[PDB]
Amino acid sequence: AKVYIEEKPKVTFKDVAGIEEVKEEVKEIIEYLKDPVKFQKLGGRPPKGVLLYGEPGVGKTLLAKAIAGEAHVPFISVSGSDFVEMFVGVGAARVRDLFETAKKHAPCMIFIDEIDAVGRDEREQTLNQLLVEMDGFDTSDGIIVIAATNRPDILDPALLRPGRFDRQIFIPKPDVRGRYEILKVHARNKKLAKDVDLEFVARATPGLTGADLENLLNEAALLAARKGKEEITMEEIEEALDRITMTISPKEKEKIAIHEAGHALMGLVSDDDDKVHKISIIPPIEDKHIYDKKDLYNKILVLLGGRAAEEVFFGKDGITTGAENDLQRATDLAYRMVSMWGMSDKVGPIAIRRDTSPDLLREIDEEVRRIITEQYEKAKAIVEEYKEPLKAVVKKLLEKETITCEEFVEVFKLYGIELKDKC
Amino acid sequence: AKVYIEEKPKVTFKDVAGIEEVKEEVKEIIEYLKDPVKFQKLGGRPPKGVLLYGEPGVGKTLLAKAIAGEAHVPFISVSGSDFVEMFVGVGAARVRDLFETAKKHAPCMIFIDEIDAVGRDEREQTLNQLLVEMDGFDTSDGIIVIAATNRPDILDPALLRPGRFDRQIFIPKPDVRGRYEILKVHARNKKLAKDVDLEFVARATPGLTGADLENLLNEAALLAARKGKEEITMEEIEEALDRITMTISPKEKEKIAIHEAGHALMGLVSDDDDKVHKISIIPPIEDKHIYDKKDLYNKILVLLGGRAAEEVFFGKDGITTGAENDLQRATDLAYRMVSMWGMSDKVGPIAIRRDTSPDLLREIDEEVRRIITEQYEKAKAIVEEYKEPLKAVVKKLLEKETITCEEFVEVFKLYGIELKDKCKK
Amino acid sequence: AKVYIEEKPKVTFKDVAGIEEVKEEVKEIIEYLKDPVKFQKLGGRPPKGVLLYGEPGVGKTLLAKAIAGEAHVPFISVSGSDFVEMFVGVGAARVRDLFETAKKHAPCMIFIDEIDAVGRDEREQTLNQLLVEMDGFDTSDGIIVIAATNRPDILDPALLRPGRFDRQIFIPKPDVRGRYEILKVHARNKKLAKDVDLEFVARATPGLTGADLENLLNEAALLAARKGKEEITMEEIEEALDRITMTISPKEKEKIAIHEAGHALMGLVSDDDDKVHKISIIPPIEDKHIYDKKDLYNKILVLLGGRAAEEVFFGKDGITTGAENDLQRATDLAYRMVSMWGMSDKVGPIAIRRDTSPDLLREIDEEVRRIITEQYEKAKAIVEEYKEPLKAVVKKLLEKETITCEEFVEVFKLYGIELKDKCKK
Amino acid sequence: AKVYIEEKPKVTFKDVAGIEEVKEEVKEIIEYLKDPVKFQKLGGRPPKGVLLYGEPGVGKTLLAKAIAGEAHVPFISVSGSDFVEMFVGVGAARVRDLFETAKKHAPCMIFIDEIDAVGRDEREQTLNQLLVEMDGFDTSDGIIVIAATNRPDILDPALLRPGRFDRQIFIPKPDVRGRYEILKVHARNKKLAKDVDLEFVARATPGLTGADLENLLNEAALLAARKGKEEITMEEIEEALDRITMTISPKEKEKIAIHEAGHALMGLVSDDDDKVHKISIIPPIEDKHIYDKKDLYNKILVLLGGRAAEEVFFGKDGITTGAENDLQRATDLAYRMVSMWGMSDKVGPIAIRRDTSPDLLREIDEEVRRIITEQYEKAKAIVEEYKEPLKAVVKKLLEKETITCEEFVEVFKLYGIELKDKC
C-alpha cells in the first residue's frame, strides 16, 4: 500500500532487446507522451489503458520503463498485491488520487504489476472505482495507464472493455536471437573473457525468461568474485547453468517443433483458412463469425495437425500429452457440429439443448468419432506426404526456435512444393 | 448518479437519418412535449416511459436528443453504470429528486443510457423506487422518461409493465440507405473531394453502426491533416476502412440473405401462421394464445426455412452455424409437441413431467426426430420450388440490405406466384 | 403505506353490472355494514376478511366500492406495492393503526389491492402482524376487510386460514351480457349516436375486461373531440377497437367452446363424480376424501374430455395446446394410481417412493399409457355419440359466451338425452 | 402475548363426555393437584408435562379445564400463536415468570394451546428456555403444565424427551356414543322438543368433532329464535346440518369399516403379533426391538389386510386410496428385508448401503414384488375365508362406529371360529 515511483527513466529502448514486434506496437504511445497537444488538436483518441500480460519475468516492468524513457516522460510503478483489506479499507479513495497527481505532472505514465490480486464485497468497491476513473479522464489529460499481471485468466473481465483497457499486448519468453540480445544488454556492465560465447548460452536455455537469464549472468560474476578472477570465463558461466537444473529437454524440443509444424502445415494446406502466423517452439474458434460445415472440418483438421505430425514422426508410442487441448478443442467442435448445428446427416437437423435418450447419445458420439477419426486420418496423410520439407522446417525451427510464416513456405518451395499465401 | 444535463438541444430530426420508421413512432411524444395542456384537457394518457434498446452505438442518445430538440423542450441525460453501491447507499433518494426537478422545469424530457447495470437486496431497493416514481406522477406533469441499454435481456422484467415503461422501440444497425444518410450527416461539417462517392462507402460497411461510421469519417480527416491535404480524398477514406478489419464478408452476406429469405418464404407460404415482417441481411415463440398441431408444424417449418434455404443454395457442405437458434427452437417446439401436448400418435396423450422409463424417452426422441426431419424435408422442397423467385429476392436483399414483406410478395407476383396475405402493417 | 381513503361512496350496485352471481354473495356483507348491532345481538359471526382475486382490471376496486356504497358505510383504500422495506422498516406498526381508526369510524369497510407484493425475515414480520390483527378484533367492532390481488398463486397461504380471510370470491372477465351491461354503465355519462349498437361491441370483445373496455369508450369520445363531433358515431367506436389489436379470434373461440363442452359432457355422463359448473369460453388436483379405482378413472376421463372433443370436432391435426394442463393432470393421476395406490394389476400393490429398477419404471409407464389411452378412447367415443347435442351447446356457448350446467342439460334434454344430475347449486 | 387465565373452574368431568378412556389416564394428575404433599412425602415423581394432541376442536381445552376443576385447583390458559418475534424479542424472559407465579399460587395447573407456532435463530432461544424451566422445577412445587396443538408432527422433538413432556395422550374425534353424550352435555342448557331424537343426530355426523357439533346445537336455537319458537324442533336441527355440507359419506363409511376390519382380522389371525386394539371407522414398525423374517412377513400381512379386505368386498375396481400408507409401509418393509437385512435368498446376505448395478436393483425389486404379492394373496385368502363373520363385524362397526378388540373375536365366535387372545 506504498510502492509507486515517479522517476525520469535512464532505461530506454537500448536496455530492452528481443521483443522487436512488441516494440512496434508501443511506439504510438511514445509519440503520444512526447507531444499530447499534437494528438489533442488533431482530434484522435488514445487507449485509456494498455495491458502487458505474460509469464513471470518476461520483461513487463522493463517495457513500461522504456515507453516513459524514450518519450522523456515520468514513470509510476506500484504492485497489485499491496491493496489488501485490513479493517474494511480505503482502497477506492486511493485510485481517485492517482489520476489527480497525474494531471499535476501531465504528461506522464502510470504502471501497476500483479493487479490480479486486488482485481480477481469490499474487493469489487475498489475494482469498480478504477473502472469509473478510466472512463472519466480524457485525451486532454495526456496521461496513460499500464497494468501488468502474472496470470491473464484470473483478472476481472470488466478491466478489458473499451475505455477500461481496450489494447492487449503479449510479451513472450525469449527465443535464441531473443536471448542473445538479452545476454548483450547485461554484458555491457560486466567484464567477459575472450573464450566466452554468448550464442551457446542462448542455445542451451529453453524455457528461460530474460529475468531468469539475468540471475545466471549475475551469479557468474558472483562465482568469479568468490573464486578470485578479473574476467568471467566459461567455467563459472556453465556452473550457474547447473543451479537452474522448468527447462525444455532437447528431445522434448523436437517433439514440440514437430507438433507446432503440424498445425502450421495443416493451415497452410487446407481449402480455406483464417491466417497462419509465427511458428515457435517456446510454449473455442466460433466468435461472432458464421462458419459452414467445410470450414469447421478444416478447423478440426488444423487442431488435429500436431498430434498427426507427432504420430507420423515418432509413431503411436511417441504421441505426447501436448495434444491435450487440441484433442479436446477438436472433439468439442465436433459435438457442436453434430448435436448443436445439425451438421450430421445420420443425426439430422435436431438440436440437443446442451433427458436425452441413450440411443440418441450413442448416435451423437458415434458421429463425433466418425468426424474426428476421418479428419485425423486426413491430417496424418498430409504430414506423411510432406515429411521431408517438414523435417527441414523442424531443423530450422530447432535452431532459430521461432520461424515466421514466410520462410516455412519457402522451405517447402525448396522441396518443389507450392502452399498458399496465408501469412 | 452525477452526469445529468438539462440543455435546449440544437440537434433535431436533421442530425438523425436512416431510422425513418423509428422516427414515425416518436412523433406522438414530440406533439406531447410541445403542448401537454392540449393532451391534458382532451383526456388522453401518454407513456410514462419509452424504451430505446439495441446494439451499442445504434443512435440511442441521438434519438432522445432529437425528440427534445424538435419539440423545443429540455433534455436530461445520465448513465446507469454511475449508481453502484459504495458503503450500503442512498441510491433510492436520488430518483425522488429527478421527477421533482422535472416538475419545476415542466415540460421537459429525461434520458438514462446503460440502466442495465443498476437494474439487473440494496440493488432492488433503488430499482423498486424508480417503479413507484413512474406510477406516482401523471399526465398533468407534462414530463416523459427514456431509458436506453446495450442489452435488453439483462434488464429487470418489472421495468416493462404498464405505467412502468409500456412502450418498446427498437433502433436497428443502419442498412445501405440508412448509412448513405448517416454519411451525409457527418459530411456537412467536413470538406470532401469531387472524386469521393458516399454510395460505395455505405455499400462496403456491413455490420457497422452510425457511431462506428463517424469513427471512420473523423479518422479520414485526421489522416488528411497528418499527410497534408485541404480535401478528404478516396485514398484516406479507404485507409480508415482497413483500421476496422467484426464486419460481414460479401460471401457471408449471400449466406445470410438466403437464410433470411428461407424464413420469409416459409412463413408467406404456411397454411396458417401469423405475420411476416421486413426481411433484412443486418443480423419462446407462443404468447398466451392456443395453437393446433397444424399450426405448430408450420411454426417448426418456418424455423427450419433458412437452413433448408442454405442447404438448397449452398449444399450439405454449405450449411452454416447461423441456424443454431432456429434448430434449437424447432426441436424444443417438437419435444413440447410430443412429451407435453400429446400431439404424437405413437406416444399418445401422455404428458411427461421429468423417473421417466428409458424406453419412453427413446419413443419421445424418435418421434421428435420424425417431426423435425419431416418438416425439414418439407422446407427444402418449398425452397427448391421457388429457387428462381428466391434468387430475385436475394438479389434485392443484397443491394438494399433490407426489403419489406410487400416487396417480397411483389417479386413473387412477378414470377406468377400468389402468396398468403401474411404481411404486417 | 400512505394511500388510505374513507369516502362515503356515490358508486353503488348501479355502477357495477355483469357480475350478478358475485353480487349475490356480497349482499350478506351489505346487510352486515348497514346494521352490525342486528348481527351482534343475534349471535352470528361474519367473515373477518373477504378475498377479491382475478385478472388485472376485472372490477376488484369497483365491487368493494359498491358494498360500502349500498350499505351507506365508509370505504378505505390502499395498495400493497406501497409497503416495501427501505432501511429495515416499521411496516408492522402500520397495520395496528388500521383497525384502531376503523373502531373510531365504526361501522366501516377497508380495502387493499395488490397485497401480493408485501405478502409473497422483515417481510414475514409485517405479514404475521396482519394475521394477529384479524384474529384479535371481533364481530362487536362492526368492520370488515377486503384485500384484492392480480395473482392468487403468489400470495401467502396463511392469509387464507379461518379468521384470516376465510371467504373466497372470484370476479371473472365479462361475457356478452356482462359487457353489454358494462357498455350501458359508462354510456350514461357520454352522448351516443342513433346508428350505434352496443350489442356488436359486446360481441367483438373476447378476452377484454370491464376496465380495458372503459379505455375503448373513453378513446371513442377522445377521437370525437379530436375530429370535431357532438355525437359518438360507429366510425370512432370501431377505430378505438383497432388500437387493441391479446384478443380471442373467432376460430379460437370455437376451439375453446368445443374443449369446454367436452369436459362438461364427460362430467354429466360419468358413473359418479363431484359436480359440473358453469361452462364458459372466457378462459394441483384433488383433496384427502378417499377415492376408489372407478372414481379416479372417471376423474381422468373428465380431464381428457376437452382434448377428445377437440379430436372429434377438428381432427388429429386440429388438437390444441389447450389440453396442456388436463393432459398433465390426467397422467399424474394415472402414475399415482399405478406407482402409489397399487391400482395396477400388472404392477401389483407395491408402492414406489423414489433407486427403482429400470424394468419396474418401464412397467409403471406402460400401465400409465394403458390407462390414459383407454380412458381417452372412451372420452372420444362419448363426444362422438353426443356430437349433435354438443354442436348445439357449442352454438349456445359461442353466442352467450357462458352457459350454466342447467342450460347444457336443457340443450341435451332437447335432443332427448338424459344426463346424470351433477349440476352445482 | 396476553391471553393466560387463573380461574377456579366450574367445568369438571360432568361437562366432558365420550372420551372415558382419556379420562382414566388424567385421574392420576387429579389426585396429584388435590394433595401434592401426599405425593412429595411418599417419594413418587409426577410428569413435568402432559401432551394433549389431536384434530382442531377435539376438546383439548375442555379436558385441561376438567383436571383443574375436579381437583379444585386453578387453571391457566394461553395460546402459542401469541409469542411471535416483533423487534428481536423477550420471549424467553416470559417463560421464567410462568413457573414463578405458579409457585406463588401452588398447587395449580398451566395450559398452552397451539404451542406449535412458537415451537416449530430467536425462535430456538425461547424454545430452549421452556426446556430448562421444566428440568429445573421439581415435585415439591406441586404444579403441572399441559401444552396442546393442532398438529403433532410440526412441534420440536426436544419438547418430548423425559422431564420435558414425557406423557403423551391422544384425544380422538367422537363416535356415535361419544357424540350422543356430547349432545346431552350442551342440551342441559337449551330447551328441546318432545319429537327430537339425539340418537339420529349422533348417527348422521361422521367426521365431526365435539366443538363442530356445538356449532350445530347453538345454530338450531339461533334458527328457533329467528323463526319464533319456544322449543328447538327437528326442522331447525336438520337445517343446521345442511350448513355443514369434511363429512364421511355412508358409502365411504362402509369402505373404511371393511378396510379397518381387514387389518384387525389379519393381526387376530397371524402366527405371532404385537397386540390388536380398538377398531374405529373414525379416521415404520422396527423400533429398538429385534425381529425375525417370519415376524416381518406378518407385519407386511397386516399392513396389506385392509386393501385385501377392500378387494374381497368391493372388487378390483372398488379398491380405494385409503391403502396409500399401508401399501407404502409394506413395500418399504419388504425393501429393508431384501436390500438391508439380507432376508432374500435370491439376493443373498449382501447389504445395499441405502453406484448399485442395474441388474442388482432389478433383482431387489423383483424380490420385493415377490414378497408383497405373496403376502397380499395370503391376506385376500384370509378375508375370503372369514367373509361372513367380517360382514357382521362391519355392520356392528358401522352402527357403533368403534368396536373394541374383545366383541370382534366374540362376533367370530358366533360364526363358530376361534381366533387368538391378542387384545
Ligand SMILES: Nc1ncnc2c1ncn2[C@@H]1O[C@H](COP(=O)(O)OP(=O)(O)O)[C@@H](O)[C@H]1O
Ligand atoms: N527482454 C528483456 N531484455 C532485457 N532485459 C530483460 C528482459 N526481460 C527482463 N530483463 C531484465 O530482467 C530484470 C527483471 O525483469 P522484469 O522486467 O522485472 O520482469 P517482469 O516485469 O516481467 O516481472 C531487469 O533487470 C530487466 O532488465
Ligand SMILES: Nc1ncnc2c1ncn2[C@@H]1O[C@H](COP(=O)(O)OP(=O)(O)O)[C@@H](O)[C@H]1O
Ligand atoms: N364489471 C364492471 N362494470 C362496470 N364498470 C367496470 C367493471 N369493471 C371495471 N369497470 C370500470 O373500470 C374502471 C377501472 O376498473 P377497476 O375497478 O379499477 O379494476 P380492478 O380493480 O380489477 O383493477 C372503473 O372506472 C370501473 O368503473
Ligand SMILES: Nc1ncnc2c1ncn2[C@@H]1O[C@H](COP(=O)(O)OP(=O)(O)O)[C@@H](O)[C@H]1O
Ligand atoms: N368431548 C367433548 N365433550 C363435550 N363438549 C365438548 C367436547 N369437545 C368439545 N366440546 C365443547 O366444544 C367447545 C369448544 O371446544 P374446545 O374444547 O375448545 O376444543 P379444542 O380445545 O380441541 O380446540 C366447548 O364449549 C366445549 O365444551
Ligand SMILES: [Zn+2]
Ligand atoms: Zn497444439
Ligand SMILES: [Zn+2]
Ligand atoms: Zn434464422
Ligand SMILES: [Zn+2]
Ligand atoms: Zn381443459
Ligand SMILES: [Zn+2]
Ligand atoms: Zn389401513
